[PDB]
Every structure is written in C-alpha cells, then in structure tokens.
Amino acid sequence: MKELVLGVVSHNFRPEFINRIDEVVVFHPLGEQHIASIAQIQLKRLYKRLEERGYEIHISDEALKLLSENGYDPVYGARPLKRAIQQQIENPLAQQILSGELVPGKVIRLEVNEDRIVAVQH
Amino acid sequence: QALKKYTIDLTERAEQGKLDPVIGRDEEIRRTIQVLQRRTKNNPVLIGEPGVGKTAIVEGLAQRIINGEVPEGLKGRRVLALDMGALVAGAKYRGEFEERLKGVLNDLAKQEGNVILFIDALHTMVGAGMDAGNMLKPALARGELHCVGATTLDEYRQYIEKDAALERRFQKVFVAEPSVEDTIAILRGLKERYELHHHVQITDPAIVAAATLSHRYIADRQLPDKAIDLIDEAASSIRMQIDSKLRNKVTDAEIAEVLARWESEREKLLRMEQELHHRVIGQNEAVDAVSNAIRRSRAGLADPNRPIGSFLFLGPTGVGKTELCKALANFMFDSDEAMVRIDMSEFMEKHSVSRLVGAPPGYVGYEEGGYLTEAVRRRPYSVILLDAVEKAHPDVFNILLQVLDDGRLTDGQGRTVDFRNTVVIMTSNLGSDLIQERFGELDYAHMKELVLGVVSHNFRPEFINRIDEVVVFHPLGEQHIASIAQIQLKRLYKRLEERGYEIHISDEALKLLSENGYDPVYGARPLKRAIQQQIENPLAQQILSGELVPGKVIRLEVNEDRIVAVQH
Amino acid sequence: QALKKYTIDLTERAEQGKLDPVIGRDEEIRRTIQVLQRRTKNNPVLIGEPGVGKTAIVEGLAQRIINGEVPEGLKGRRVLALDMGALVAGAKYRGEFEERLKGVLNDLAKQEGNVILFIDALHTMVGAGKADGAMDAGNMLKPALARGELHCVGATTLDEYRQYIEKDAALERRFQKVFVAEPSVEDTIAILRGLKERYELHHHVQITDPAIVAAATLSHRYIADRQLPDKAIDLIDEAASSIRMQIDSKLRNKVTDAEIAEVLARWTGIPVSRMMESEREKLLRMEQELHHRVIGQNEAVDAVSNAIRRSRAGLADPNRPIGSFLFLGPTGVGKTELCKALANFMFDSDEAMVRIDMSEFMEKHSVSRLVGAPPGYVGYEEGGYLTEAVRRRPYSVILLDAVEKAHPDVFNILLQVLDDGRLTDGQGRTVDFRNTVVIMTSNLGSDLIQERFGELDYAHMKELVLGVVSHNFRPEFINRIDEVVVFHPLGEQHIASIAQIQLKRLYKRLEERGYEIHISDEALKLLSENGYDPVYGARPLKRAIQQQIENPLAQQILSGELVPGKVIRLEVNEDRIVAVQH
Amino acid sequence: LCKALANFMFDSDEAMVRIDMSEFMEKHSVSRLVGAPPGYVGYEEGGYLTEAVRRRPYSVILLDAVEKAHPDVFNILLQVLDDGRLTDGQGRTVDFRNTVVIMTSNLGSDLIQERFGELDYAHMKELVLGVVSHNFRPEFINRIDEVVVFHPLGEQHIASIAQIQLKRLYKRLEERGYEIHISDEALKLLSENGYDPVYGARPLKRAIQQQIENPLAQQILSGELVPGKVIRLEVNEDRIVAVQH
Amino acid sequence: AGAKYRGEFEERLKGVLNDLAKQEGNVILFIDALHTMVGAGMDAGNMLKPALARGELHCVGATTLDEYRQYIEKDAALERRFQKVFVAEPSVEDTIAILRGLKERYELHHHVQITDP
C-alpha cells in the first residue's frame, strides 16, 4: 500500500521532492472499539461543557451502544459520529434546558427509548 | 558649481594623463564619433552586460580628444558623467528629482553645448516614480544634450522600447564581452601600470592562465572585470608575501589558489574508468564503455550540433543504474545534483507531449512549463535521466530524434533549449531475463548484440540508430552488492561518528545484513531499506533511554536471528 | 516675470531664425488656425503617431507668424512653448505648484489675447501636479479652457492620448482632435528636398537627390520601426556623418544612394546593396555554390536560384514574399541540406536561420504556438514564436519541414503569409514577411517518385505529384506556392561525392585538431558499399560514416597512436578501414 | 476587388482594415477582436478592431477566407450587421455605421466552377446560397445585403490581367530604368502558358514570373543591359527572350 | 551634535575632507554604515564620492550585504572603489576564545566569576 501510494504521489509531485519526506505515512479507516473509545472522549468533553454550565450527566452503556451503532461508518471519517452525538444528545437536551425545566443538582441520566435518547429528572 | 556636485570631468585627468590607457574597442569609439557628429539625435547609447568597460570607452574617447585623435568637431569638449542613483535617492517628495534635473539643464545651458555627458543605466531614467523622459526628451531632440548612454539590451527593451519616442533619439551601440585574447591585449596594455604601481613584475603566462581560467570556472563577473580583479588581488597577495617578514612575478599557482579558494581536468578525463570505480563496484565493461564515450566526446571529432552522448540502458533496475548516473554527474561536471529523474511510464498520450515539452499558449501548463525543458534551462550542464522508455507514446520519440539530431528543442513557450552539454540516459528493462538468466559465463559483447536485436524488434530502428552504445548492466553478484552494503555501513558509521560513536560489527552480522534484502529482481535499494529499518529504529530506542555513551565501543554482535548492540 | 521663468518663446527663436524650415502640412496648419480663432475651446491638439512632425507643425506656424503669412487676427502674436518640467520641479511644499500655475494663468489673462500657448506632451500635462491632495494641471487649466480664454496647442502621440487623456473625459473634450497622418512618399521627398540646405550647411558635404528619393523609397518599403519623415531624415543624417568621417579620417565628397544602401544594410542587413562584382559574380555562380554542398537535385537548385536572382535584381513582387516554395522527395535526399545551403549562401552560416519542424504540430491548436495567444489568455505578453523570430530579423529564411505530419488546418496562417507577407500576432500588429523565403518539405509521393523517376520526364512527374498534392492539401494553399519542385533518389556517384564532402569537412576538423590524414580510394568504395540504399538515401551514409569513422579513428587518437605531422593514410583492412602512421 | 475599393475610396491600396479570419480558427480569438474583459491580461489595450474603428470610422472591414474560422465567431458580426455597434472589453461602444463590411469565401467553388455555365446567375446564387445556409446559420446570412457569386476567368480576362501585370512590371522597371517592349505573339505565349480554368489568375502570374523575369533577371545580372535601350520581348520557338536595340 | 546650520556641518565635512587630502595617504579611515552616509540628510555620501573618484580616500566601510548590494553596487563610482569583503561568522571555538578574552572584563565589572564549562 505504501509502495502504491508512493507511486501515486510520484504521479502527483516531483520524484526527488517526495524522497525528501521523512516517511510517506498512511492514515486509514478505523475499527469498532476505537469508535466507542473516541465517543467516550466526546462524551467527556460534553460532560465538561455542561459541568461548566453547572449540570451533571450520567450515561447508560446501552446509550453508548446506540451511539456506536447509529453514528458509524469507517468509509467517511469521524464527524458522522460527532453530529450523531450532537443531534441525538443535545437537541432534546436543548429542548429541555431552554424550557426552564431542568433544576441543577439532579442527575441528568441519559436513558434510552427504543432508538432515541431521553434525559430524565428524578 | 553645480558641476561640482554631480558631474565628473574626465578631460581633467586625461589632460593630466591620469586615467587608463584604454586600448581596444576602436570601432565602438568610431560609432560614438558617428552619432556625436550628427546634427540631431546626438545621444548615443552603449549596450552590453555590466562590466565591459563602457566607462573605459568614454575615457578612451577623452584620451583621443586630449591626444587630438578626433575630428575637428569634438574638440574643446568636457567629458561629464551624471548620477542616476542620487537624483532619486535624495528625492524625498515632489520635485527634488526634477529640481536637480532642471538645475543641471540650466547650468549646462550656461556651458553652451561644449560638454559631453555620460549616463549609465538608461532603464533607471524611465522609472523613478513623469521623471526625466518628459524633461530630457526635449533636450534629446534639441541636440544641446550630448549624452552617452549605457545599459543592457534586456532592460532596454523592457523599459525603454515601450515608449518609441524615447527610443528614436538614442542610438544603439552593442558593446559585447571581449574575448580572452582581447583581454590579453588590454592587460598587456595595462601590465605596465600595474608593475609601476606595486614595483613588481608580472608573468604573462600567468596572465593568459588567469584569463583562460577566469573565462572557464567563474561566470559571476565577466571580462575584463574579473581579470583585473584576479590580477590585482593576486598581486596584493604576492605583495604581502614580499612584505610579510620570494618572487615579484605573480605566478599562475597563486591564480589557481585564489581561483579555487576565493588543475584536475584532463587526466581526470583520462582516468575516467578509475573515476567510475571510485564509488561504484562492478560493471567493469560498462565503466569502460562510458569512459570511452566520455573521452570520445572530449576528443572533439563528432558533430558540433549533437550532444555529448546518446545512450539507452537496459537490465535489472535499482542495482546502481541511478547510482551510475549520480557518480557520472559527479565526476562529469560537478556533483550529485545536476540530474533530472523522469519516468516515461506516465507519458502515453498527446497531452503527455504537451506536458513534457511545453504547453501551447493559452493552455493549462504554459508558464508552468515543460517537465523536461524547464529543468534543462535551469541546469544547462546536467545529465538527463529517463525511466521505462518503452512506456512512452510513440510521438515522444520524434522529440527524442530532434534531441539526438539537432541537440536543441523549441519548447512550448518558443525559445531554444540547447542539449549539447548534457548526457541522455534512457533506462529500460525489456531484456531483463535475457541478461539475468544468462548472466553465467556469457560475454558482454554478444549479450549486448543479442539484447540489441531484441530491442531492435521492440523499438524503432531509426531511434536506436542514433544511440551510441547500449551497455548491458549485468546483475551484480552477492559480493559486489555486499561490498555496496559495506560502503553504506561505512557512510552510516561516518554519520554516527559525526554524532560521535565508536561502532564495530560482527562479520556474521555483516552476512545477515547482506542477506536481508538481496534480490535480483528489484535492485539494491531493497537491501538498503532492509538494513536501514533493521538497524536504525531500535538503535535510537536504546540511545534515548540513556544507555549509549559517546566513546563506548559498539560491536554489532549477533543474536540468534538478530543483531544486538553492546557498550564496551 | 513669471512668463520669463516657465515659458519659452518659439516666435522669438523663429524671429532669430533658429528653427527649422517647415514645408507642407497645409490642411493641418489651416485647421489649427481655424481652431485657434474660435470663441469657446480654442485649443487644437496634434494627435499623431510618434514622429510624423507634430512639433514641426507648431514651429512652422510660428514661422508663418514671423513671416506674416497668417490672417490679420494672428499678426503679431506670440507662441509660447509651455514647460512642464519648469513647473513641477520646485514644489515639494503644498500649493507652490498651484501658485506658479495660477500666476501663469493670470499673466495669460493679462496678455489681452495675444499669447498663443503651446504645450508639448499634453499627456505630461495630465499627470502634472499629482501630489497627495493636489490638483493636477487639468483641475487648474480646466476653467480657463472652456471659456476660450486660453490658447493652448497640444501635441501628443495617439497611444498617449488613449491612456492619459481618454481616461479623463473632462479634459478630453476641452481640446479639438487634429489627426496628423504620416505623409506619403512623394510629399516626404518634397520635405527632404526642403531640408537638404540644413544638412549641407551642417556637414559641409553635398547630397545626391536620387539618394534622397531612394532613401525615402527604401525607408517606406523596408524599415518598419519608425514612421515618415523620421526614418528618412535619420537615414540622410547618418549617411552624412558617415561621409564626413570617410573624408576626415583617411575618396568622395557627396552622399550617393549606394551610401544609403550601405546605411540600410548596416542597420539591418536586407541586401539592398548594389551588385558589386564580387557580389554579382557570386550571384551568377549561384548553382555552382549550391553544388559545393549539395550534389545532385538540379531542378530545385535552378528554381531557387531563379527566385533569389529575381529578388536581388529589383524584380521582387512587392507584396508576396521572396519565394513561396514546396519541396517534395523521398526520405534522406538532402532537402534540409539545400535549405542549409541557402542559409549558408545568404548568411554565411547554416544555423543563422529559423527552422520550425511541423512534426511538432500534429494537433491543431499549436497554431497558437506560432502566432500567439489572444488578449486575456495565458501567453499574451510573449508573442508567437514565428512572428517574433521574424520581427527581429525580417530578412531571413523560414523553414517548415515534415509538412504531412500536421493537421491540414494549420495552413490558413500561411494563406495570409503567402498572400501578402502579413501576419498578425496575438497583440495585434502586422509583421512584414516581404523579405522571407518559405520552404516546405514532405515525402508524399516517395513511393511514386522511387517508382517512376526513371523512364519519365521531370514535367509529367511534377504533374502527377501535383495531383497527389491536390489529394493532400487545399486548392487555396497550393495556388499560393511560387513553384513546386520534385526530388529524386540519388545514384551511387552522388553518395560518393557526399562522402568526399564529409572527408573534406573531416580533414578540416582534423587540421583544426592538427592532423595530416589521407585515405585510400578503396576505403571510399567500401564506405559507398556500406551506407547505401535507394530507399533511405544518405542517412545510412550518415550512420556508416558515424560508426566506421568516428569510433575507430577517435579510439586510436585517444590511444596515443596518432601523432601530429605524420602522414595518415586511411587504408583498408580485410573488412574494415585502418589508419597508418607514416 | 476589396483592395480596389480601398484604392478608390482612400487613394491608397493598403489602407484598410484587413482582419482575416484565417487566424480565428477557434472560439478563443473573439477576444483578440474585442479586447480582453476587465482584470485580464491585455485589458488596457482594447480590441484590435474596435480601437482601429474608433480611430477612423469611415473605412473598410475586410474578412478574407471567412469560412476558416470556428463557426461561432460570426456572432460578433450579428451585432455588426444588426446595428453596427460593438462593445469591447472596456465597456464602450464603437459605432460601425459608416464601415463597409466585406467577407470573401469559397464555400462551393467546385460547384461554381462546375455549373456557372448552363445555369443563370439567379439559380446559381440560389444553390450556392443553399450551400452557405448549410455552412452558416439563418441569423447571419439574413443580415448580409448581397451575397455575390464569382465565376472564373476566360482567355480575354487572362489577357487583360497579363497586360496589367506587365504594366506594373514596366512600372517597377522604370525606376530601374529599362523601358521594355513586348512581342504581341509573346502575349499569346503567356496566355497559352498561363491558362488553367481551375485556379484562376495566379498561375498566369507565376508563369509570367518565370518565363519573363528569369531571362530578364538573368540578363540584367549578367552585366549586359544598359538603361535607355529599346528592349523587346521577342519569342524563341518556345522561349521568350529580351533583345537589345 | 555640534552643528545646526546647512553649511556648518557641511563646512566641517569639507574641512575634514581637505585635511584628509592634506595628510597624504597616512590616514587610513573607517566609516561603518556607508548606506547611512548615502542617506544621512548635498548628502554626505555623494559629497565623499569626489574623494572616492579623485584618488584620495583610504576609508573602510561596514554594512549588511543588502545595503552593499542595493545602495552601493547599483551605484557606479561607489561600486568601483570597493570589494565584496565579506565578514564571516566565526566558529564556536573562536567565540569561546573571544569569551576568554573578555571573561575577566565582565567579572571585574559585575564582581562575579564565570565558569569555563
């Protein structure tokens, strides 16, 4: 693969220009568990943003599997997962918070529907 | 006077005789007399590269005036010279160029036209912010101006041939660079002045040696400027050698010292087989063929409209084919950097030709230019490298026939790209297994003839007609490629000794390194990358942990299947 | 006063008579007077292309004022050549230029309608006082212009008019356009007959009046740089200085038309020079000199000899080029050799010419490579290669080789070329091809020529190959050809003579190397046996000479075998050719 | 005919706007007739055409070899023949309502050499106008006022052309100084040596060129002829030579 | 600093140049920033240019290659009195030797000591 893409860049560029590269390196699509780990990272920064808002959030691992099965295809990149997170978490959450409903202090548990994600206040 | 502000009298010092006894360039002085003795348009201009003695032309005209060697209309004149570099650099705001300019014009109107002015850099007069074409162009047509212009043809047609009204007054006088023998004649006219200055003598064989070597090796400044510079600085060096704490005659040895610092040509051409085996092992017959072709090109019997040598290369790639081209460029002209690697694998169409030679105007790759010819224009003494020439479109071979016939090639942009100073290397691998499988005990010549017949059935016969010699590039054995791996280990140890580490090796480790990436099908660079990736990566892993110390003996001892580094 | 500081009285100079006699220009001076006697916008501007005599119109008007040959309203006036450099120069302070210009304008109002103002370089008056927040001269003159109370006279080039005045319409309508055309030949001869007295008083020499009419005639025909009368005046002046230095340095005392031709040939090198007996015996030995390099192929030598003689003999078709040719023959019969022979005859060099091989142009759009690219596109500011290569040195030879390779519609360009010698590059200026020779080569009926050059006349062979050419080209294009010639395969005697020529240039280059070398005629016979075929001609002789001479001889020179001064006979081996050292 | 128009109208042969479409073989060169649009390379130079009609409006536009161009260049001339206003790259209009627009082509000259006989002028104009309708669009050809048809030149016209070219030859040679006569039979040799009804008048001219000027330039450059002599173009059995009397 | 007239600073410059002509080659001068003498504000560079082109100047210049290339080489008489005498950057070891030349200077000023490692 490195040899063939090196031939491709040789079709693109000067030949001895790309000899001066430190190394022709390859980035690639990624596997299943990497998606779940980086989704946990994005959930962590979401927790940080809403803790700076003043809100504290618990998640279901079922909801993590819902995210990992909804915002998934290696064929494009990461940001389908990012806007899947964005939509399916924040949009009901922005519906609930600007409603003036969520009192701080109560745990924002990311419960699930059959497909969607619900935040409750018990 | 305002003449005591920006003008220089040369009839002053020439009446004193205190200028250069200018010898040569008589015809340019004659045409200056032709323009200056007209009734109108009496402002000649001198055209040439800077440093051709145009100031000396004006001063020699002044000396002919003082000597009375001029006709009776040039007499009583005063040679003047105006600055074009202070009328603008002093000019802060509106009208300080023009104020000084009109002051000069009126104070020369007091002089009543008995004054000849010099002006260099006529291009500077056009653009200074309007400025002076609109104020000298009347005096250019009034005839009361007696200017002497001096610039170069390229700035002349870039700036000055725009406005034809400025063009119609000045009269072009081409002052080219003088020859080596004209330089000899001028310096023999000026050896007396040097030897009366430093109270020494001058070797005239060292003069002609300085002229020849200054013409050959250095092209920064030109004749006669560089010869004056080298003679005066070498005379200064000899003067310091005399007055340090012994010869008065400056020798050509000091000329060569100031030449290289501030001769190995002919026998290096004669010993070119040893030169090719200075860095490349194996391919002895190919070395002999290349060296004989180089010497025959330097023999001076072939066509002066044809290049150094026409070549086609065959055999297994990567074994040192490119390395041969690198060492050939090194001991041919300079170094390992005058070469252009070109894959003919890409070019298979008509717009392939439009890429490689040059686009027609109005199209996609035009001032991006041709892939070959622009790189030739940048490096006029190089070696042209081609790769997989069998993968070319057939009309590219018409361009190749133009190369091997005329030694020149009009690009898409429309100019001349000379080829009589490079080496056409074209590499292929059509008769690969004919040489690889029959490497054993078959000669160089009949294998060459056999694969020559094969490629004759492959390529065009008129194409390979122009080829001087096709070397074989027989597959090197394990000992030659092992020795090349040893040389790579030597330069590796050289760079690590630049880093500063005493490093040894096991011979079994050397055998395993030689047997990492040995392959007759691909080339030597698999062995290179194999040894590279095996050694280099765990090395720095051991280093930056804080294990290795500069000065410790590092034997590359073997593991069972690996190589371990020790610190002893 | 302020008029003394910044204006120059031309009428006082013509009162001293220190200005040039101006003859002609009657409708131009009359319309200038008609504009100068008006009520609003009195101001004529001499739009004329650079160097047709525009300053001299106003100078002749000043002389007609001094002589009193004007209407009564202009008798006693003063023409003041206004200076712009006198006004810009002293003012880096704010308002100091406007101070000067307003003081000048108040003086011109004070002069009660008696001063005619002349402003040379009106385009210098446009960008005059352009300091940061400053009026130019336009914003200050512009009141007094269109109240009629200033009698300005402009004098500008037409290209300066477009950029510097038509960009500013306000000052552009304040004047009155006076087109001042370049004069025709006969009136320019009349003007030069007027100006003979000045140059006779200057250089103390005389001028042939046939040399004057020849200078005007050849200047209008051949020089395309400058414009009349400027180029002819410069011819006469430079000839006068040349005659003055021929007398004064080390013969004659006048300026003949041969001196005009020598000036023109020194300036470019179009061979207008009269047939001196060296040149004329050279030209009568045309075919003899062409067979000093090209053996055989007599008929094209005859045709091109005829064409160049008709060119040099003053029988040139003054619109078509010198010779519009077409070469036809099989591969390797020295067509390019004949073209290099013409270049060597004409210019003492083979590659003092332009060869453009049309095998490079197998696509259509390389038309734009040789004629240029339009405004807007990429290579606009460079020109076409062919047009520029002519535009430097118009007297040259334009060679097109391998004409069957290109697309058929490249040859509308050469329709223009062989109709008038005119070609219009991408910037849009004409390039005169009236001093060019166009040679086109192909290998169309090479099978037919190799088949039927025997047992056939030259004429019906030319007929049949012309039929083949009409199968190839357009009927428009082949009408433009002066003559189509037919080549033929050579006999072995021609190739032996070519081998003799190669031995001559070889011995020349080896005397340059410094070796006295001879050859056995048996070796010449072996070389004639080697590089011979009727199908390909002498390119097999080229490669045979190449290999069997350049490899062993240069190999033995570098072997230290060949000592200079030794007689070196190139004798034969059993199958090869051996050098000896005797 | 167009240069004769220039000679009548301006007392001058080569004073006309000759923009030959034989360079304009692409849709590109519309730019080089109406200048580059703003921001591009030769913007401040304008069109070649609209500048040189803004200088002198009363002139002749000449478009020789008009069919060679890419067929959608003529839309410029849709404007020129509808109103005679053209808009170059600098936005301004150059008013062509005094210009004399002339176009010359040979779109059916095989058919015109084939059938100018045995058909009248009207049906020939009809059929060649059908051919031009196959080569142009109805937009363009509806603008042209008169589309004439030209026929080739028979022997009388060839004799007249030979006389005019020998007039300009003698007119050149008068400044060379050699008043030369001719045999009246030599005119018949030129007619019989210049006659081919498929190429018109130029083979006549180059036959005149060869069969007169090559002995003439041969004998003048021979060091043989002195000015003022009565010189005649007497014939040989096949040649025509110059004699000195 | 001691001049405030257009014709007193220039008077000083003229008098010093006449004294340089008077000393008859014994004085070998140095002036750094020759481009600054070109543009100081008749500017002083063009005032000393007669002392260039009269065979009297024994001065030395000092600048960057940019000002020598632009403000000097592009001038004519200012070119043909000089060379491209290039000041090199020294070595690290030469720098350490020069530091040893002036270690004691800084130590005696600041009352401290400097270690050679």
Ligand SMILES: Nc1ncnc2c1ncn2[C@@H]1O[C@H](COP(=O)(O)OP(=O)(O)OP(O)(O)=S)[C@@H](O)[C@H]1O
């Ligand atoms: N025929 C000659 N006799 C004596 N000295 C000569 C002759 N030709 C050139 N020189 C010297 O060659 C040197 C060339 O310097 P310049 O006159 O400055 O060259 P240039 O042609 O004027 O170009 P630039 O732009 O001024 S460097 C001077 O020192 C001249 O004195």
Ligand SMILES: Nc1ncnc2c1ncn2[C@@H]1O[C@H](COP(=O)(O)OP(=O)(O)OP(O)(O)=S)[C@@H](O)[C@H]1O
């Ligand atoms: N009718 C004429 N009679 C006499 N001399 C003439 C005549 N027309 C032009 N000349 C001369 O032609 C030369 C050039 O004409 P000028 O007017 O000086 O040039 P110009 O008109 O200023 O052109 P530009 O704009 O400066 S490029 C002068 O020497 C005039 O004397």
Ligand SMILES: Nc1ncnc2c1ncn2[C@@H]1O[C@H](COP(=O)(O)OP(=O)(O)O)[C@@H](O)[C@H]1O
């Ligand atoms: N009559 C001749 N005189 C001199 N050289 C000739 C002649 N005929 C052929 N040659 C040689 O043969 C080659 C033919 O050149 P060229 O005219 O380019 O061939 P082509 O006929 O294919 O155009 C030349 O390079 C020349 O060396």
